[PDB]
Amino acid sequence: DKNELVQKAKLAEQAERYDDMAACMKSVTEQGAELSNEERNLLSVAYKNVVGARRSSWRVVSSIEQKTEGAEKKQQMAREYREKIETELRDICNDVLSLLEKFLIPNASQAESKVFYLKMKGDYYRYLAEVAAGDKKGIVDQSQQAYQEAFEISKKEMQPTHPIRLGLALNFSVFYYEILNSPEKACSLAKTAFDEAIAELDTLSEESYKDSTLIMQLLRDNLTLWTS
């Protein structure tokens, strides 16, 4: 039953058992009905944490693999371990990208969720791009095209302070910086999104969306990071 599966996802979330949480939400998604905003959040939280664990482990072990040139046994072990983590990571990404293509993007009936899922597609292809090595070209272009479509829709459909629009700009700037090694484009995109939001906020007498404060902080701080 869907409500049982959703209740279980919420338990798993509280317990920080994200592999459990993701299995529940995969199952819900596969029932084929458009997700509620609550269910969409549960799906996204679960898989962001599942994949994030593997990405973090991959970065550490890939760094060690690089550092051990000349240490034949240690480098082979680090390589094999990096490949095992990378296999998990590719499997998670492909699962998410299959859900997006089979269920989530097609069933999206409002612009907000369309942008959210196209952004997610950009994200999980980006995570594949972090580890891919030719194969990579196509993965990069799938990420860019998903992000670009989301971006265009968000500019027509969402205020500058909308957290999905801002979170999209944030991740799309990271794509340019990290995947395309295009730091000028990354900084331009991030600064423009921040500036448009500040301009809106400067015309408002009420508070805007509470989740956008966090995203604006990260936009600003990436710009500082990227300009050392």
């Binding site: 990290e178 990260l218 990071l225």
Partner: peptide, 10 residues
């Protein structure tokens, strides 16, 4: 690394 969206809805 860069900071990416924690996709948090409060």
């Amino acid at each position: 690394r860069s900071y990416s969206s924690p996709d948090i809805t409060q």
